[PDB]
DNA sequence: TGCATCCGTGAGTCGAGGGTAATAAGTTGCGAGTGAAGGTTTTGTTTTGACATTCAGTGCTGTC
């Protein structure tokens, strides 16, 4: 959280992907403004994204499975 | 007045920086005698003695 | 927008007109009153652009009435402005003139023609003519003709020869010539006579000719005919605020072309006489080069400043230009400076900040939040609401601030940890607050050293300031395995007072129940910080698997030692806090804390070691004075007892006995021999002089001095710094630096002399004039160390290739030096390695070597193991994580994506600033090893050797060596190798002056091959009588026997030569000078006795990396075999070697002493001269090349107290070896050296099964590392920093291109760096090339 | 000293020096190596393009902060093509090979 | 710069491009008006806006307004006064109150 | 294999007050171009025959 993002690296496996997979996560909530999964606890968007990470909730695949159902469910709406 | 660091001394080795305190600590001691002897007002004969 | 690569070539004069917009024909810039751009001028609107919005000059086409219409009266358009930077102008010359990058420097144009620059300089200066083309074959091309011999070439023939004297005369020589006739005729005779110094010009031109062929460059463009003019936002003409103007320099320089070109085309119209038109075209190239290089060709050119001008290239040259100062480093918004100050209440991830600084800095972030609040309505409204002091201004400020971390910076940056990223806390001040514990990370203290501040505005870098650079992510420095939160001054002192073992404190002996209740007793005045009190505790261990197992025990401990147990998170023994807790123990007590419990407890822990360290100092108080320093009474007599002796050898010096050196070396000793004992004067008088009485008579314990508790703490110094206070302060010296005869008898407690204070400046002003230029020499050395490492980023998990270097200790010289396990620690094993009970292989060809597997190797007595280095890794364009082991900074398995080199280039160049300031005896008992030995049993019984490679090494019985020492060729011993030697027994002995020529064979002597007057003298011993034929040195003797090698033949009674045992080689000593053979004729000498004796830094680091050979290289043995000697001193001695089956004779400076004799055998890997020792790369392997260098410069740091992991230097040795000279051909060129990786490419496509053998074999090469950055495939990586004129000539003659692959390339162009967070990007860019 | 967004020069479109002319700081080339060893790539794009030169970046950064969408649209520095026109001045053709 | 550090090239500013805060207030000026024009009518928008040339390339005048709708140039200036008056009632000029303070 | 003759690098941020000077010909026409000035011209703006229309000024009628 405020002090530590080490447990956030024993989840993914990479210090640099954490800079990417949280930024891809928080950009759906910075200006995309979606619902967060953890409660807020009066924190900015970068802190709820890392608190999301520790319980195994936002991965590289979970950032893409969440969109790929959402892509075709949007692409079953245009026609 | 000033609480300052002790350990600026031993590698700079200014023992004379300490001796600015030692001699002048009773420069107050002279100025604590006479200032205690002007609210008492003994005579000239003790200030002329001192 | 986006572009893949770039390209550079010579620009044709057709390319220039297609680049441009209009021909600048008049020097007028602005009129004298109407400040206006000028028609047909330099700032012209008809060429370069518009200025005001949709507004022409005279006022015909305005206000979008006529969209695409030029005001044809004045020549000016209406269109969109700000093209005054993009839009170049041009100019057409009348006489063509020459580029100065392509002429002055090889010349690169006369180098093309093999024509001298002095042959050019009669032509392009208009001194004498030259031929263009002899029509008749009587003359030949490239022939300078003087103007008087030109008329003879005129009046002979007239028409059958063509010759000018002009720049056109060189221009005609480029249009005329062909290359396919030349470059296949240079092909024709490269095979005729390939002698090198003629063939190296056949190497360079078949480059240079065929450079132009396949690329598309032409050398016609190499002499200018058209010029491009800089868009006037690069050459402005600006006013000041006071109506005064100030220009760029190039408006002046461009002016000197357009006038002097004008008074040629006008002077051509009037047909000036043929003397003057020459000087007309002289001045153009005088003034064209004034643009390119002001002070290059002749005398410098200055103006009204009376100082030289900044040229066109000087905007790219040096650090005054744009590569070194305005592209890599920059200016920056969103930043500021202030002064530092401490905080004893910030936690580690926090830091202070002013309000007035942040509210002024975070002004773009407030104006977004106020509209989301709506108290401010618009933008200009919200700016108004800053000055009006709203409570919501400081309720949005903190709400902007919270979870937005912030960089801080300090100069000089010396390594990675100079920049960090804390979290803000506000305070009501104007000075940047800072944590105290980060002062080890900066080598800084609080004397007003300012610090920068920076904000990561984007989302992504804000995460980098939290995931990468947040100050609790990185505690462990990349130099070693000890952290950088070694507690600095008072936290190491507040402990050392508190943990102590005296008997003074009341309450000692009764038992307590818990470390809570000591608060109830010590504060009440029934307890003392140090009172030795039995206490029952409850510690915790992890003897399960990550699970706490309880135990509870009692400890006869002290009270202050017990209160530390209130914090420590139940994993450490009570024995770890059972000491005095100096700086030695505390830093390991963090190291052992995260050795066991992981990282995150040791960031909470160091928080609560700082809060106590001031708090029990605030109980204690540390006070110093004059009374604390005590002189013992043994000062008067100890100097007086030598003071009677300083007149003693002076009185010898009056008797005329003692010389200068024997008296100077004795007055320096006895004056300082007692100074050695003034440490012994203050030890027993000031260590246990205390007498506190406690249930006995007295007590001998620790001191109550409050000084020796400061140095065993670790705050400032140790027991050598008191010697400048309590005793006398050593000796003194001159700024020349010779040691003084009379040292000091006074100090800082009594009072020095007016002369003792005079010469004290000498050691001090020099001592600051030394280091004030020793910070320059490291900011040099760092800057090129980061340039060889600018390509190094990991690629793959494994190469899986052959094994590499071998891990052994460095224990030579004295005792243990480096533990093998620590050099083992952090790595991956290379070879399948076992335990000393056979075949217990602990690796599956690779194991990560952390500390518990290091404990296994310390357990077994085995001490040799192989570990992959960067040399045995062979992934192209990177290294592998299976050959790096542990990233020392993060402290676990190195991932994929990280940098490698620049962390080591920050590691190695950091403590360069902190750096610059007989008989061999056995030590203990054990085993004996001395191998690679051929020796003899002497006339005394013991091992006497007659070989070079032998030396003594002392081992224990287990196998792990204790000592080793060099023994000379011919050393007399006292025990045998492979025996038992007791401790303290004299093994070896030899005279230092002589190197023995001791007879290994045993035969009679005979005075052969020397007759007195030819190669020798007769020097009989007038005292003894015993003297043989005395050989003389190399210059005194007669030349009539100087071609005859003088040999005392070993003969027997029949007349033979007594052979060596084993060989049929004759045994006679070809004895060189100064070697007086003792015994006369007919005497049998033994085996093993002397026939003749032969009696007699940081720029140091800048040899070891800058790839320099010494001035006195010690030659090795080229090829082995039975060697003879050679020629007699035609400059130097030659060496006739004849191998056992193989195939050289070369120079020898014979005025030094040789090693191997005229007929002795030598093996490769042996010096043939004496001295210090590229050759070891030429003839030996690869690993031993890296061995001597790593074991020399890491050795330097141990001498001056630094520790650096040897991998960092090994990282450079891989970047020190990139190239490979080639022997054969068939696929490519023949002998030019090339990239070793690419030399491993063409074996894998052609020497592999496409063809049986068509390739070319190759060794390893070695550049200087200051030019290995200049000798590169990328060129802007080489043009950014050094010699920018040269590297942009050769890049353009060949038609190079770049791939933007180095990380200095992606940073200048605004791209993302190919490392770290951006490496996971750049491979998608890399995979999109191969797929589309 | 402090500067959010202040004044700029004329030849290279860069911030200025000092506490006097309302100036920005200096991010020296020693620090870029200190930043490379963290692998923090994006701040190196941030601290040259959007904070020093790239004029489309330095507005669309500063406009987007007033929205909250803390997003970068970068570009090329104007001190890169101040180098092109001077290396093109000396008869050398430099260019960009488009993808 | 008396040490070899600085020159006259450091010390001059180019006030040409736009101020950073003022180039932002151009859009907040523009996105004000269309919302303020949204409380109007289509024939009412088309007489006042394109006369001033908002979001069009050109500046239309009273003649090109007159000859297009029918003939009339007289009453369109009076049409805009009703586009002045209801918007000068301080109910839709709140987001004109600060740009008034230029 | 030397002999010298030129080439080219020496860390890093802030503060510092403001700054240039030598020398020189006139007389004479005549052309291209900054002002004032001629107010008339293309476009902003004033009232009257009238009619479908909203509406107010006449008396009316109707209720509670
Ligand atoms: Mg300091
Ligand atoms: Zn005009
Ligand atoms: Zn490898």
Curated annotation (Swiss-Prot), chain A:
Q: What top-tier enzyme class does this entry carry?
A: transferase
Q: Name one GO biological process term.
A: regulation of DNA-templated transcription elongation
Enzyme Commission numbers on file: 2.7.7.6
Q: Name one GO molecular function term.
A: DNA-directed RNA polymerase activity
Tell me the disulfide pairings in this chain: none
List keywords of the entry alphabetically.
Answer: DNA-directed RNA polymerase, Nucleotidyltransferase, Transcription, Transferase
Example of a GO cellular component annotation carried by this entry = cytosol
Which reaction is catalysed here? RNA(n) + a ribonucleoside 5'-triphosphate = RNA(n+1) + diphosphate
Mind telling me which Pfam families this protein's record contains?
RNA_pol_Rpb6
Q: Which positions are tagged coiled coil?
A: none
Name the domain of life: Bacteria
Please tell me whether the keyword Transcription is annotated for this protein: yes
Q: Which SUPFAM superfamilies does the annotation name?
A: RPB6/omega subunit-like (SSF63562)
Q: What does this protein do?
A: Promotes RNA polymerase (RNAP) assembly. Latches the N- and C-terminal regions of the beta' subunit thereby facilitating its interaction with the beta and alpha subunits.
Subunit info? The RNAP catalytic core consists of 2 alpha, 1 beta, 1 beta' and 1 omega subunit. When a sigma factor is associated with the core the holoenzyme is formed, which can initiate transcription. The rRNA transcription and antitermination complex (rrnTAC) consists of RNAP, NusA, NusB, NusE (rpsJ), NusG, SubB, ribosomal protein S4, DNA and precursor rRNA; S4 is more flexible than other subunits.
Instruction: Write out the similarity annotation.
Output: Belongs to the RNA polymerase subunit omega family.
- Alphabetized HAMAP family for the sequence: RNApol_bact_RpoZ (MF_00366)
Name of this protein: DNA-directed RNA polymerase subunit omega
* Gene name of this polypeptide: rpoZ
Swiss-Prot record, chain B:
Biotechnological relevance of this protein: Co-administration of salinamide and rifampicin or salinamide and myxopyronin suppresses the emergence of resistance to both antibiotics.
Post-translational modification here is noted as: Acetylated on several lysine residues in the presence of glucose.
Tell me, what does this protein do in biology? Answer: DNA-dependent RNA polymerase (RNAP) catalyzes the transcription of DNA into RNA using the four ribonucleoside triphosphates as substrates. Resistance to the antibiotics salinamide A, salinamide B, rifampicin, streptolydigin, CBR703, myxopyronin, and lipiarmycin can result from mutations in this protein.
What family, per the record?
A: Belongs to the RNA polymerase beta chain family.
Q: How does it assemble?
A: The RNAP catalytic core consists of 2 alpha, 1 beta, 1 beta' and 1 omega subunit. When a sigma factor is associated with the core the holoenzyme is formed, which can initiate transcription. The rRNA transcription and antitermination complex (rrnTAC) consists of RNAP, NusA, NusB, NusE (rpsJ), NusG, SubB, ribosomal protein S4, DNA and precursor rRNA; S4 is more flexible than other subunits. In pull-down experiments interacts with CedA.
- Protein name (record): DNA-directed RNA polymerase subunit beta
User: Which organism is the protein's source?
Assistant: Escherichia coli (strain K12)
**What range of the parent protein does this fragment cover?**
1095 to 1144 of 1342
From Swiss-Prot, chain D:
Where along the sequence do coiled-coil regions lie?
Answer: none
Record field: transmembrane: none
Report the SS bond pairs.
Answer: none
Family to which this protein belongs: Belongs to the RNA polymerase beta chain family.
**Assembly and interaction partners:** The RNAP catalytic core consists of 2 alpha, 1 beta, 1 beta' and 1 omega subunit. When a sigma factor is associated with the core the holoenzyme is formed, which can initiate transcription. The rRNA transcription and antitermination complex (rrnTAC) consists of RNAP, NusA, NusB, NusE (rpsJ), NusG, SubB, ribosomal protein S4, DNA and precursor rRNA; S4 is more flexible than other subunits. In pull-down experiments interacts with CedA.
UniProt function note: DNA-dependent RNA polymerase (RNAP) catalyzes the transcription of DNA into RNA using the four ribonucleoside triphosphates as substrates.
What name does this protein carry? DNA-directed RNA polymerase subunit beta
List the taxonomic lineage: Bacteria, Pseudomonadati, Pseudomonadota, Gammaproteobacteria, Enterobacterales
Curated annotation (Swiss-Prot), chain E:
Known outcome of mutating residue 42 to D: Disrupts the interaction with Escherichia phage lambda antitermination protein Q
List residue numbers at the site (Interaction with anti-sigma factors): 51
Region Interaction with anti-sigma factors: list its residue ranges. 73-88
User: According to its UniProt record, where is this protein located?
Assistant: Cytoplasm
Q: Which residues bind DNA?
A: 62-81
Top-rank lineage group of the source organism? Bacteria
Stretches for region Sigma-70 factor domain-4: 36-89
Oligomer status and interactors: Interacts transiently with the RNA polymerase catalytic core formed by RpoA, RpoB, RpoC and RpoZ (2 alpha, 1 beta, 1 beta' and 1 omega subunit) to form the RNA polymerase holoenzyme that can initiate transcription. Identified in a complex containing RpoD, the RNA polymerase subunits RpoA, RpoB and RpoZ, CRP and DNA. Interacts with Rsd; this prevents interaction with the RNA polymerase catalytic core and with promoter DNA, and as a consequence, promotes transcription from promoters that require alternative sigma factors.
Q: What does this protein do?
A: Sigma factors are initiation factors that promote the attachment of RNA polymerase to specific initiation sites and are then released. This sigma factor is the primary sigma factor during exponential growth. Preferentially transcribes genes associated with fast growth, such as ribosomal operons, other protein-synthesis related genes, rRNA- and tRNA-encoding genes and prfB.
Q: Which family does it belong to?
A: Belongs to the sigma-70 factor family. RpoD/SigA subfamily.
Q: What is this protein called?
A: RNA polymerase sigma factor RpoD
- Its source organism is Escherichia coli (strain K12)
Portion of the full-length sequence here: 512 to 613 of 613
